[PDB]
Amino acid sequence: EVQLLESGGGLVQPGGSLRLSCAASGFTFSSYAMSWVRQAPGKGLEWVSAISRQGSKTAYADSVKGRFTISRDNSKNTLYLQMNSLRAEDTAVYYCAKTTTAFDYWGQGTLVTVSSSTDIQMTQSPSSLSASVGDRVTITCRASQSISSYLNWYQQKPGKAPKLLIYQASALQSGVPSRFSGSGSGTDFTLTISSLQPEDFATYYCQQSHRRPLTFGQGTKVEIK
């Protein structure tokens, strides 16, 4: 019954503007911080923005600084993203995400097409792989500097929004099968699938919630042959 319903995307010329909305139901919206995460076509996940429970504090990635504005209306349970000065580089599916120590629940995502460091680097290995049902699959995630144990794993089906699989290196989200395990601390982490199933095909992303800005690995696509 937890729902995040996004609207407002579409096609726009460079320099124009769009306003995204995320309509939340099924939890107490004002009890949680909220983010926007975007994914350029065939590319990875990138954190964009975040706002505190009451709306008093906001944060922005450098890429969208000055042009994008996040806001919320807790009386309508709605999260907003005003995007001005749109560039072709802003071209992406945009997700809203309930934000705790991970991104717990993601909206379905709205496409926005624009046409006419000291950060922690997450690197995954391999970048994709193909294996058979029953195989044991292992994925690695390295941080360029320590992130303690604040490493999150997300599962993304083709065309679907990411789902949170494991957070804080080893804690399983509710309803995730026990075939999924995570381990590691500091700079080296691992996701393991004990017995691969047909429904497990997806791209798997790691993401650190140790220091802003929140950063993603580039993903590991897994195919079942």
Partner: peptide, 8 residues
């Protein structure tokens, strides 16, 4: 306040 301290 984990996310408050982390993000803001």
């Amino acid at each position: 306040s984990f996310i408050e301290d982390l993000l803001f």
